[PDB]
Every structure is written in structure tokens, then in C-alpha cells.
């Protein structure tokens, strides 16, 4: 269910464009995962 640190690092670039061009709780979450690394 949960996503680990390793995966968050991997996804970083792919998720990036969508993340900033988005909002809500989930957008904020993913942002935190990649950023805080």
C-alpha cells in the first residue's frame, strides 16, 4: 500500500511536471516525498 523512500526518489522527475501543475492534499504529499530527500 505505502510507498518507500527508494520509490519516491525514482519517481521524482516523472511526477515533477504534474505535481506543480496540480493541487490538493495528494499533490502536497508527493511534493513533500521527493523534495524532502
Amino acid at each position: 500500500g505505502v510507498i518507500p523512500k527508494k520509490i519516491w526518489e525514482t519517481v521524482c522527475p516523472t511526477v515533477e511536471p504534474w505535481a506543480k501543475k496540480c493541487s490538493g492534499d495528494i499533490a502536497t504529499y508527493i511534493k513533500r516525498e521527493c523534495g524532502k530527500l
Binding site: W18, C22, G24, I26
Partner: protein
């Protein structure tokens, strides 16, 4: 995109897509699956 990584992140990405800007939701789904 991946076998493992795809399935892992994608569910989260869909939740994000619900309230994204412009029409980013489309892009999310395109890469991902359900």
C-alpha cells in the same frame, strides 16, 4: 511505465489527478492504468 514502480505510484497519482491544474489529470491516467 514500469512493472513494479508503475503500479506503486499510479494509485496515488490518480488521487492527485482529481484536482489538478489545466488538464494534468489526463496525462496521469495516460501513463498509468486501472
Amino acid at each position: 511505465w514500469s512493472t513494479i514502480v508503475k503500479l506503486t505510484i499510479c494509485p496515488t497519482l490518480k488521487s492527485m489527478a482529481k484536482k489538478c491544474e489545466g488538464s494534468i489529470a489526463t496525462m496521469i491516467k495516460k501513463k498509468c492504468d486501472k
